[PDB]
Amino acid sequence: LTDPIADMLTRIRNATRVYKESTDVPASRFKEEILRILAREGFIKGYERVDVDGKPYLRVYLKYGPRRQGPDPRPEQVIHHIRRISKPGRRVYVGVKEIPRVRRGLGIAILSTSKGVLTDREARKLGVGGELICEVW
């Protein structure tokens, strides 16, 4: 397997499209830092380090909206959108000045910076740039 992060974001995206309570991703200190932001910014309920058949995973507790009236009862998503930017194929970095505003503010962009994993907002407050890991809304 060639990309942990891209696998991670994807493990979720499939889980939220059929409303599972949770789903597990292979554990990493970098995934904890991203789930951390994904916890705090409230796209997920939160997560916990569990163990599967002797092997370390991270169980991620998904979060959704309310049932809807109508032909399609399926509740609205909380993570409408999640996708890698920087990839092993094509590394993507931004200086502070060209840090993007995801979805006119209503979304976030996660970063890897020399000060840690930060959002579009945070990075602009601290004044630093970094590798643009992904975008979420």
Partner RNA sequence: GGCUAAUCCCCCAUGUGGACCCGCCCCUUGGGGUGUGUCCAAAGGGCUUUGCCCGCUUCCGGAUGGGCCCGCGUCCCAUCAGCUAGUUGGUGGGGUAAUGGCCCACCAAGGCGACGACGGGUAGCCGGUCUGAGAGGAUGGCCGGCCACAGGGGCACUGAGACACGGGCCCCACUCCUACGGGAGGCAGCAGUUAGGAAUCUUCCGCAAUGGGCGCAAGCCUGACGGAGCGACGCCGCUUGGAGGAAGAAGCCCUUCGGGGUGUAAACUCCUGAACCCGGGACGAAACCCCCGACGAGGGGACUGACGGUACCGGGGUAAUAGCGCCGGCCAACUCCGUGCCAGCAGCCGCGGUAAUACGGAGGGCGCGAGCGUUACCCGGAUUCACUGGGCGUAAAGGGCGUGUAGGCGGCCUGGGGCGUCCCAUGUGAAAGACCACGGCUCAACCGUGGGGGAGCGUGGGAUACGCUCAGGCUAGACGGUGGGAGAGGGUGGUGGAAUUCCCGGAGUAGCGGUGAAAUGCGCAGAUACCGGGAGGAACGCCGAUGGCGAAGGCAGCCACCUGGUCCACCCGUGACGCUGAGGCGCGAAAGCGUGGGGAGCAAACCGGAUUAGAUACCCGGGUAGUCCACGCCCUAAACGAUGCGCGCUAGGUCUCUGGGUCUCCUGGGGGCCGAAGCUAACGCGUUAAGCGCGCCGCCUGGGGAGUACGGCCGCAAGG
Partner RNA sequence: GUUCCCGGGCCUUGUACACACCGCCCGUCACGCCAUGGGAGCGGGCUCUACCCGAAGUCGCCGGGAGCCUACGGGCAGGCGCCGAGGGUAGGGCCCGUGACUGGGGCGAAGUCGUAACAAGGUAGCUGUACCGGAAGGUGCGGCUGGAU
Binding site for RNA (CB under 7 A): 1-4, 6-7, 9-11, 13-15, 17-18, 20, 23, 26-31, 33, 54-56, 83-84, 86-91, 93-97, 112-117, 127-131
Q: How far apart are CA 45 and CA 35, in angstroms?
A: 10
Residue type, 71: P
Q: Which residue has the tokens 């962009």?
A: 109
Nearer of residues 50 and 96 to RNA, judged by Cβ: 96
Q: What is the distance between the alpha carbons of residues 65 and 75, in angstroms, rounded to a whole number? A: 5
CB of 91 to RNA, least distance (A): 6
User: Please, which residue, 14 or 40, has the CB nearer to RNA?
Assistant: 14
Q: How far is the CB of 45 from RNA (least distance, A)?
A: 18
Radius of gyration of the chain (CA): 16
**Shortest distance, CB of residue 77 to RNA, whole angstroms?**
11
Asked if residue 59 lies in contact with residue 11, where contact means CB atoms within 8 angstroms, the answer is no
